[PDB]
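Hi,

I'm pasting everything inline rather than attaching a file, because the server keeps stripping attachments. The sequence lines come first, and each chain or strand is labelled.
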Amino acid sequence: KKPTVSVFSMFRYSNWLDKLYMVVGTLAAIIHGAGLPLMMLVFGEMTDIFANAGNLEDLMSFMNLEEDMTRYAYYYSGIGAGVLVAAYIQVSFWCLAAGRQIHKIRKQFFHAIMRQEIGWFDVHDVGELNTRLTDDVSKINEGIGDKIGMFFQSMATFFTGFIVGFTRGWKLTLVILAISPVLGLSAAVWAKILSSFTDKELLAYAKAGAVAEEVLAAIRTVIAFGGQKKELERYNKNLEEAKRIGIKKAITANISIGAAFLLIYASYALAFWYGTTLVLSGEYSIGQVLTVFFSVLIGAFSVGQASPSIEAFANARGAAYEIFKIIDNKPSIDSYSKSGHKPDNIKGNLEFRNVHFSYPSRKEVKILKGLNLKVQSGQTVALVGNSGCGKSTTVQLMQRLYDPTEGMVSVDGQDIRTINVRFLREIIGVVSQEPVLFATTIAENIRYGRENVTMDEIEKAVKEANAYDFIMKLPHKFDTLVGERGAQLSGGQKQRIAIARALVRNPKILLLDEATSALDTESEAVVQVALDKARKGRTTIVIAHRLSTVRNADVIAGFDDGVIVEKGNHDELMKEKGIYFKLVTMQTSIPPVSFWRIMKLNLTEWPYFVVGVFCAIINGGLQPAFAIIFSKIIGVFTRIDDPETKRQNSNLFSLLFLALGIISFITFFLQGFTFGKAGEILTKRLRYMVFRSMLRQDVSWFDDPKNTTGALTTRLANDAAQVKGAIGSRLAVITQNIANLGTGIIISFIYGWQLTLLLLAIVPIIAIAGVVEMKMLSGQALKDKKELEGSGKIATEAIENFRTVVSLTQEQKFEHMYAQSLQVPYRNSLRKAHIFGITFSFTQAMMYFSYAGCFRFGAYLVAHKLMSFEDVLLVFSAVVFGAMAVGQVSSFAPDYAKAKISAAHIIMIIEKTPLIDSYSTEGLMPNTLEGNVTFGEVVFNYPTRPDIPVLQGLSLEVKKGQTLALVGSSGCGKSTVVQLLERFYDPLAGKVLLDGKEIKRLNVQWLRAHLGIVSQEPILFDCSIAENIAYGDNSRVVSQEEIVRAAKEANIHAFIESLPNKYSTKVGDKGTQLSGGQKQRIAIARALVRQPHILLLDEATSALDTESEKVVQEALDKAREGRTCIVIAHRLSTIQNADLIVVFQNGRVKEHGTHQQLLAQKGIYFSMVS
Ligand SMILES: O[C@@H](COc1cccc2ncccc12)CN1CCN([C@@H]2c3ccccc3[C@@H]3[C@H](c4ccccc42)C3(F)F)CC1
Ligand SMILES: O[C@@H](COc1cccc2ncccc12)CN1CCN([C@@H]2c3ccccc3[C@@H]3[C@H](c4ccccc42)C3(F)F)CC1
Ligand SMILES: Nc1ncnc2c1ncn2[C@@H]1O[C@H](COP(=O)(O)OP(=O)(O)OP(=O)(O)O)[C@@H](O)[C@H]1O
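And the predicted assembly:
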């Protein structure tokens, strides 16, 4: 973060080869940059040879104009040969040196990250650390890459040009030197603008991007509450600012380039005026004036080309400071370490004694105050207590995830503090609540625990757990491919295979932490069976929720208020009547779009396009005008006239130069203004329409795997801003290229056809040379960050779940995987360095060889009296310099192909029409609904995978005032029925009624606004508390009285009153931290403001504590009252407070009856409640 680090300390991983590369690259760069200010020295003397003979011929009316020009053809070929070799060395060597140093840094930085222990990752954000690995290293690479050689080349050009200017003629050099600072400043500004191109500016758009992300991620709730119009309004309000910022950016860029060109042409005019004054006197010659002026001007404008390199180097140092800080940091308990104490046969005897512990982030407070245990081999320890006493702190402390501030922990006599770190974490097997799985196969995940394991032990471990049927029935058996972070598998299966993975390690001291994790009922029972199967000959500390499995335990340690007080088995705790007994009583592809359609999108802004095309014509018509004026101004001295006529003509031509500069600035500003405004308006309109279309489309469209939230926001952020490049930029590029190149070719053919025909063969190569130079100066080949995606995925999945990784003792494994994934792109970059170097060198050298070829043929033609020197200059400066300008213009513009590809998607999504339209005004909104929801033989299938049906003709019938309960396995039709009753999807078959009226003819907006729902998981908006609670009945301004009475009804109007600012806190962020109980209560409060006639809930309490669950449950029970409320919950939570129970079996209903019938009969419901 600090750029104040020594220059040479940056080059710390420099081998001998890298240092030799740097020195030879620097020498080659100094050589290469001395060519252009030297070609204007040969070009000056060549002009004198042509001009001197021209005076002699005119006086006589071309003897040695063909012999002398032979020598100067060699000089151009020599300078071109040097640039052919020097430029190859400069670009390739510096890129090779940087490509090698960064490879060491990238591997070494990942070595430091894995070395750091838990606690370092608490202070250092995992997201920020992941960002530094992928972006800061790239910043370093850009800083120490080709830009250093570019800086050396620019400085060499500056010094060589000024030396040549002073040596040839000092009088003219001083005049340009006086105005040199402003030229250098303008060049530096233009270079910084050019380098800061091709990177998307999302700082302005982030405001709207946050809203888009939150809406699209939570599209279910937005559709449920019918707030889509409000979200669209908010999105437009946010979009306006980004539109303004984009307009300003475009205007600034065009102003900068226009100022650069204006200064160039003004310098031309002043220098030529003073040069004519000198030449008429006789101090100088036309060739000497050309040499001095061109050399000094190139030198002055080249000192600004090195400006981006200095800033890049400073930023590289600043970004490398933190990376080097992490590298040289030594953890105290690092897993690597160096050997350590290691017993042969550790029997296993845990020991806690005076354990005082505090979390490093908040060490001012303490959680542990003297925990002490005496569990020996073969026993079992259980922990019971309230939420907040620190029942997982000891779990993390046992396997040396931290260090106790006071006291000691011992195992088998010896203290843990003197023990080999790898051995300890190897003998300590652990499981947690979340069964995190890696992207590799199930068998590969199993092998991840211990590498040197064959298939036989994996089979044994799977047999021990419960997977030898679940994975065998699945395709691909053991090697089943885990995809999309374990999308196929569900929670219980992941937990079972995580138990198997823990079994694979064959540990000696097991350690379970909240393994239950409320995995419904059957999954929970199976997990408990697997857990008890696992615990046979192992010292375990079993922390369990619901406090039912803790009954059977050798020592049920009572974790209450730090130091454990309650102790003993169930009978002793029952006699003592402590926290254990109390809580026990408590519990018991797309075809391309034609250019015409894309053009029609921005048709409403036609005047902008008209003015822009006119300005593009006037702007592109400037290079041939410059060629004509240059040829005329040199021909003024070529011919024999009287001095006064020469002076007057030269002054006229200088004024023409100044007028050209003024026109260039004006047209650049106007073209930028018009085209930028048109593009920004088009982008805003496209984003608005795409967002509206996305909101209108049904849930099935979002459920499609291609249409993910990330993909949709990427479309809305990138493609809707790239579409503008297929109309305005395309028109400007084509118009400018035509109006310069065609005009130059036509003018050249009129004045000379032989030389034009010869020069028409190098035009493609010169244009490609300009394109290559412009695509290297802007770093377009360096902003790319592809071919490292696999390594980035490995790094992310190893740094995000670093706790599981460090508990699994796998650092060398991930290090080697990262190195292997980095190996191939290293060699690819090494080859691409040479490829790019040779391409740049050849393309640059063609520009130097063109002089020799063109002027040799021109010498022949002039000798044989077929044209004049002025015509040769006109043809050259119109066919070659025009080609350079064509190549440069065609590169400083967005790519046309990607623009049309994005426009295809934009046009596809804009015109899309849904099935369940959410904007259909047609409807039959009645007076009052009695909430009679019935289902008849309804068969439904998911749209993404219409292969196995979910519903098999359900039959359902509910009257007003009756509370219906439905129970079944997890993932069954209950959630799908909830979705379908709200008309989220379309049933394939069956009928849905509502007070005798079919659901087809009911208005969608009326239905979704006529009832309220509570989501299975708590979903919250980042708006204020007042807005988040007023996000219920929309299209109506609500008062605070309704809000407060709903909060009172929801049993939440205590915590809100116990908060600063009351009903104004920024909910979902800052320090609100509602946990889960308060989130559920505020969600049901938001659902209660609408006063729905029918209320739907689905597993509100899923993974809450043993205290906040009761408050939410009683709030739900109170909220029902006289409403047609459907309820899905965890078994006895609300199943017995209802009236009728519905049983689901493979989607279709199984039995229908009251509680007494189902309980008395030996049915499935009795089976799962026995
Ligand atoms: O390609 C080399 C070598 O070019 C030649 C070699 C040999 C003979 C030649 N004969 C005639 C013309 C070029 C010749 C020169 N580039 C030409 C292109 N510069 C670009 C550039 C881009 C767009 C508009 C104007 C400019 C000009 C300088 C500049 C300043 C800062 C950042 C970038 C640049 C500027 F703003 F003033 C870099 C140097
Ligand atoms: O092709 C033109 C015009 O380019 C464009 C025209 C219109 C629109 C454009 N839009 C985007 C990019 C380029 C555009 C640019 N060359 C390249 C830049 N000059 C090079 C050059 C090289 C290094 C440093 C400074 C310069 C500048 C002039 C100069 C004088 C004598 C010999 C060569 C040159 C100078 F010493 F003062 C020639 C014109
Ligand atoms: N990442 C963390 N950084 C700092 N303090 C934390 C962090 N996680 C938890 N704590 C604090 O550590 C203390 C003990 O946490 P505790 O073990 O009770 O966590 P838990 O997730 O509720 O688990 P358990 O229910 O098993 O006890 C609490 O005061 C808690 O706020």
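The chain has four domains: 1-7+26-102+123-169+286-302+313-333+761-781+836-866, 171-283+592-752+869-913, 349-419+543-588, 933-1167.

If the labels don't parse on your end, tell me and I'll reformat.
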